[PDB]
Amino acid sequence: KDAWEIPRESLRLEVKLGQGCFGEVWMGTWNGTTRVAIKTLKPGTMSPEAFLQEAQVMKKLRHEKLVQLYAVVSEEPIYIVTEYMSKGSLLDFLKGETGKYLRLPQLVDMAAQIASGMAYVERMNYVHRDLRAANILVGENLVCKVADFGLARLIEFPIKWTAPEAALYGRFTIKSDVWSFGILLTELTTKGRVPYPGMVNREVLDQVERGYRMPCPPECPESLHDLMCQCWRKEPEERPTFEYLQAFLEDYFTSTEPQYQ
Numbered sequence: 001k002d003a004w005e006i007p008r009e010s011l012r013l014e015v016k017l018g019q020g021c022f023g024e025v026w027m028g029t030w031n032g033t034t035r036v037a038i039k040t041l042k043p044g045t046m047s048p049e050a051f052l053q054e055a056q057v058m059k060k061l062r063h064e065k066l067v068q069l070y071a072v073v074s075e076e077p078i079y080i081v082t083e084y085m086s087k088g089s090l091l092d093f094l095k096g097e098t099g100k101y102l103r104l105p106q107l108v109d110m111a112a113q114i115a116s117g118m119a120y121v122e123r124m125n126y127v128h129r130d131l132r133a134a135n136i137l138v139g140e141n142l143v144c145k146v147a148d149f150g151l152a153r154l155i156e157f158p159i160k161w162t163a164p165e166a167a168l169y170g171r172f173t174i175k176s177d178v179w180s181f182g183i184l185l186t187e188l189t190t191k192g193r194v195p196y197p198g199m200v201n202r203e204v205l206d207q208v209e210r211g212y213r214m215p216c217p218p219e220c221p222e223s224l225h226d227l228m229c230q231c232w233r234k235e236p237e238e239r240p241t242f243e244y245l246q247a248f249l250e251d252y253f254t255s256t257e258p259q260y261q
């Protein structure tokens with residue numbers, strides 16, 4: 001086994017939070033004292049190894065802005081026990097009645113937190129590869145944590161969120177994640193709308209190659225859109241670092257938009 005293994009009896013699945021095709025997510029209790037989240041595996045869907053590699057990545061990462069792994073049960077049905085995030089998906093949140101009231105300051109702040117989680121990823125020499133709102137979890141007090149580390153890997157695919165060079169040539173770097181982050185900014189500034197409204201995957205790929213970039217979302221300051229465009233520079237190395245993005249977003253209302261309403 002490994003040091004992250006826990007007896008299945010020390011878990012108590014309670015509310016089914018969600019369900020996918022790989023299995024489902026449950027809010028439960030661990031050791032009778034701890035509130036947790038449990039990701040289960042549907043026995044046929046994917047190999048134990050394939051499902052658990054997400055947990056393999058999480059054993060090497062630990063940051064306040066990344067969903068924390070608590071333990072695993074590696075005998076079918078396989079379980080991945082993580083910290084529980086009380087508000088669920090950022091996407092559902094941005095879409096819901098809940099998020100219809102979020103204003104730019106809260107939005108920029110959520111971005112700053114995600115950028116901080118990614119800045120850790122960046123300095124740990126990893127690439128997430130699946131960065132988008134659906135993969136960010138919201139908690140109490142609008143705390144945003146990065147989740148879904150299954151595709152993440154040590155730097156040894158939806159064209160809408162994936163950088164061109166990563167989607168076309170498999171060139172996955174922290175800079176391709178920076179591209180995804182710029183797309184994630186549009187999701188935050190539009191209430192979770194799907195990027196490139198009215199364009200099919202093929203049209204997106206084609207258009208992005210010709211230099212097309214999404215225009216400034218309504219109500220989004222031009223300065224925040226410029227940051228998005230920096231995240232989408234065609235040359236991966238011209239794209240800002242997550243360390244830069246985190247600082248820029250945290251200071252946004254003083255250093256970039258002091259006159260803000």
Ligand SMILES: CCn1cnc2c(Nc3ccc(P(=O)(O)CP(=O)(O)O)cc3)nc([C@H]3CC[C@H](N)CC3)nc21
Nearest residue numbers: 017018019025037038039082083084085086087088089
């Ligand atoms: C396993 C990591 N993790 C840790 N916490 C998680 C969580 N929490 C969660 C999701 C939804 C609600 P909710 O429906 O009651 C919210 P509300 O609308 O009443 O405010 C509450 C907690 N949801 C999901 C997953 C679960 C499946 C989903 N497609 C993606 C996130 N994954 C979570």
